[PDB]
Design a protein around this nucleic acid. Structure first.
Lengths: 222, 79
DNA sequence: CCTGCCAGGTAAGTATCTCTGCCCCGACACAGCCTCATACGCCTCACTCTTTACACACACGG
DNA sequence: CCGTGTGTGTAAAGAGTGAGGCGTATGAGGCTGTGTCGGGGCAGAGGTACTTACCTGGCAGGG
């Protein structure tokens, strides 16, 4: 008894099931009914030396499907289910294989022609324009992306030069979080002018050359 | 500078484009094109003939899809 | 306990880039005049389907 | 034969969006100036066929 264990009671019961392939219209009709409780009746006729299997579509559903059996000796097919409760189980072993084919010979192709047309409906293709488009690159005094960036820069304003003591106190607090800091990233934390930050950082901070990437600043005075 | 030079070239060739039309095809704004345009004229010691209403009728009317008769009427009315 | 020439296979050789600091800048305020251009905003107007009210009418049925 | 139970007109609210003009605000332009700061180049480390030649494996002797 485990989550990964597979139940084999169905196999031990020698349960037999049939594997049948059906066309789209038959399945589509069943999907359309949404499982009202019945979609048709399967009729099996066995003669002295032959067997006949066919399916009859429901009259209500419409508003013959002869079945051809196939040999199963070529493969061993078994059905396993994955319950929503995470309890895998083996439904059984397939004992017969069949295929469903339509009864109509030529008039069926008319349905396929519509089906192919339906399948090709969303196939987009180029369109021809009578007139050359004149709505592109319309004259404008300033681009919308540019006024927004200009407004944001104006609203934010230029970074101010704060007193040395406050910058130093904030500068060292940053060093606590990370041993090494990049000048470009350090500027954001301090929110101070690059020249002013470098001047204060130069007095105490030092540059350490790293061959892996580049030379960066050291916030340690020594 | 390239946007302003493009504006000046159109004027020199007799087919002026508006500063807005040049700005539409350029990331640079109209104000910056106009400023570079003045400096380029000073630097080159050159000038551009004043634009007239008839310098834009063919492009504006053709883009609006107006007939030749309407374009001629608009050209006469403005002049 | 080493040492080497030849056949076969292979192989040439020719012919027909990503950051990175860094000095030398634009654009901010803001002053009056001034003309025309561009943007916003706000209330008044329109209208349109969908009820909302209200006097009146009209079977309806046994 | 007079009760009552349902219909109907038609502008009147009731929202439900939608539209349009106007008036105020904004801008752009040189100008001139002054602190400043992001900025933007700026170069810079730093990471198709035939023939001939050459090399390798093998078996052979030699010492």
């Amino acid at each position: 008894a485990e989550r990964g264990e597979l139940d084999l009671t169905g196999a031990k019961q020698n349960t037999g099931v049939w594997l049948v392939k059906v066309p789209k219209y038959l399945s589509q009709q069943w999907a359309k009914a949404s499982g009202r409780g019945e979609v048709g009746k399967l009729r099996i006729a066995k003669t002295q030396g032959r067997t006949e299997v066919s399916f009859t579509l429901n009259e209500d559903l419409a508003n013959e499907h002869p079945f051809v059996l196939q040999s199963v000796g070529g493969q061993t097919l078994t059905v396993f289910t994955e319950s929503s409760s995470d309890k895998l189980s083996l439904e059984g072993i397939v004992v017969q294989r069949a295929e469903c084919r339509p009864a109509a010979s030529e008039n069926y192709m008319r349905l396929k022609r519509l089906q192919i047309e339906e399948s090709s409906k969303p196939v987009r293709l180029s369109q021809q324009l009578d007139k050359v488009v004149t709505t592109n690159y319309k004259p404008v005094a300033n681009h919308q992306y540019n006024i927004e960036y200009e407004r944001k820069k104006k609203e934010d304003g230029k970074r101010a030069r704060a007193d040395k003591q406050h910058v130093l106190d904030m500068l060292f607090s940053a060093f606590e979080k990370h041993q090494y800091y990049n000048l470009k990233d350090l500027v954001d934390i301090t929110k101070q002018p690059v020249v002013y930050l470098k001047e204060i950082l130069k007095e105490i901070g030092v540059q350490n050359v790293k061959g892996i990437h580049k030379n960066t600043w050291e916030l340690k005075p020594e | 500078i390239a946007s302003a030079c493009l504006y000046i070239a159109c004027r020199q060739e007799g087919v002026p484009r508006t500063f807005k039309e040049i700005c539409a095809v350029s990331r640079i704004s109209k104000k910056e094109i106009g400023r570079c345009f003045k400096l380029i004229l000073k630097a080159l010691e050159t000038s551009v003939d004043l634009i007239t209403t008839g310098d834009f009728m063919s492009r504006f009317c053709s883009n609006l899809c107006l007939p030749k008769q309407v374009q001629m009427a608009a050209t006469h009315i403005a002049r």
